[PDB]
């Protein structure tokens, strides 16, 4: 009765409030503090208008910075991609009931593909699936994925893990930890952006350390 | 560069181990499926569409793109009999899957293919006054995925998406 009203409000509304630092985001009962820090630099690295002679980050990710078919998105987009990835990683990989997977799938697709703050859920089979258990399941698995991201080390030349890849049917999300912060990038499922000769498309952005450090 | 006399020649090539072959085989089928109604019927008679739809889900992306083009071309120039056959094989879900991809070109192909199926439902509604393929698209999460495309960047996609919702759904 009341449960549905609340569960819908929380899952189907990605609230964004503009602030001095950047944005205040609220979704699925979770607060996030997104910021502009790094985005200034991130643009200069791609267009190649920076002071120093070279950049270590620009060299490590040429499929992003030296790719004419890549484009930069906002930190809000970065957050959505991580959230979408958290759902896709922890949950959808296991074998669970099909209407639940389709529900999580739709929600991750809404986060990943669009920039809309409201999700008008028109698929009916899913709409009935929306429970407090479902919300609870998402919340915990978002937190797990964030802790999993916090466990990453900054890109290095040892054997220490520094990134995470999530491969869906239609996408490949890669989140790598750098000195700037978490470099979030979205490629085609065949990773066509890596093709050095004729590089495929890729959206990417930065999520600053601070946003995740609140949870750790 | 090479020619074939028989059509079931390609049925073998679509089930090869090499992706590079399968991809180019699908590209060839799409050219045949782009033709007239008898040419489409030839492909139906050789049992090619069943393996195309299997490819459209299971195969890697570059191959799926050409398999998609092939099926959308069938729905474009195909007869009411031929389109119903594709739907019976279960091509709507495979098409709805493509709606969320990054490549705008492939999204438009999926939208056209779905529209072709939906416009056929307008005729079928006159012949229970309801479009049968609306229910099937909703159940394949297509309705929501089309809803997403209303807010898409590309003009040609978001106008098509708005049109489909107003005309057939909302
Ligand atoms: Cl909380």
From Swiss-Prot, chain A:
**What results from changing residue 56 to I?**
In strain: Isolate guinea pig-adapted
GO biological-process terms attached to the record: symbiont-mediated suppression of host innate immune response; symbiont-mediated suppression of host JAK-STAT cascade via inhibition of STAT1 activity; symbiont-mediated suppression of host type I interferon-mediated signaling pathway; viral budding from plasma membrane
The outcome of changing residue 156 to A is: Complete loss of interaction with NP
Assigned GO CC terms: host cell endomembrane system; host cell plasma membrane; membrane; virion membrane
UniProt keyword list: Host cell membrane, Host membrane, Host-virus interaction, Inhibition of host innate immune response by virus, Inhibition of host interferon signaling pathway by virus, Inhibition of host STAT1 by virus, Interferon antiviral system evasion, Membrane, Viral immunoevasion, Virion
Cellular compartment(s): Virion membrane; Host cell membrane; Host endomembrane system
Task: Mention one GO molecular function.
Answer: structural molecule activity
What InterPro entries does the annotation carry? Answer: Filo_VP24
Topology relative to the lipid bilayer, per the entry, is:
Peripheral membrane protein
Q: How does this polypeptide assemble, per the annotation?
A: Interacts with host importins KPNA1, KPNA5 and KPNA6. Interacts with host STAT1. Interacts with host KEAP1; this interaction activates host transcription factor NRF2 by blocking its interaction with KEAP1.
Similarity-based family: Belongs to the filoviridae membrane-associated protein VP24 family.
What is the recorded name of this protein? Answer: Membrane-associated protein VP24
Q: Give the originating organism.
A: Zaire ebolavirus (strain Mayinga-76) (ZEBOV)
Curated annotation (Swiss-Prot), chain B:
The GO molecular function terms of this record are: nuclear import signal receptor activity; nuclear localization sequence binding
Q: Provide the residue intervals of the ARM repeats.
A: 1-34, 37-76, 80-119, 126-169
Instruction: Report any one BP term from Gene Ontology.
Output: protein import into nucleus
Q: What is this protein called?
A: Importin subunit alpha-6
Arranged from A to Z, the UniProt key words for this protein are: Cytoplasm, Host-virus interaction, Protein transport, Repeat, Transport
Q: Which family does it belong to?
A: Belongs to the importin alpha family.
Mapped onto the parent protein, the portion here is 335 to 506 of 539
Complex formation: Forms a complex with importin subunit beta-1.
- The cysteines covalently paired via disulfide bonds are none
Q: What function does the entry list? A: Functions in nuclear protein import as an adapter protein for nuclear receptor KPNB1. Binds specifically and directly to substrates containing either a simple or bipartite NLS motif. Docking of the importin/substrate complex to the nuclear pore complex (NPC) is mediated by KPNB1 through binding to nucleoporin FxFG repeats and the complex is subsequently translocated through the pore by an energy requiring, Ran-dependent mechanism.
Determine if Translocase is one of this entry's keywords. Answer: no
Q: In which tissues is it expressed?
A: Testis.
Localisation per UniProt entry = Cytoplasm
Superkingdom, according to UniProt?
Eukaryota
A single GO CC term for this protein reads: NLS-dependent protein nuclear import complex
How does the record comment on the protein's domains? Consists of an N-terminal hydrophilic region, a hydrophobic central region composed of 10 repeats, and a short hydrophilic C-terminus. The N-terminal hydrophilic region contains the importin beta binding domain (IBB domain), which is sufficient for binding importin beta and essential for nuclear protein import.
Q: Where is this region: NLS binding site (minor)?
A: 1-73
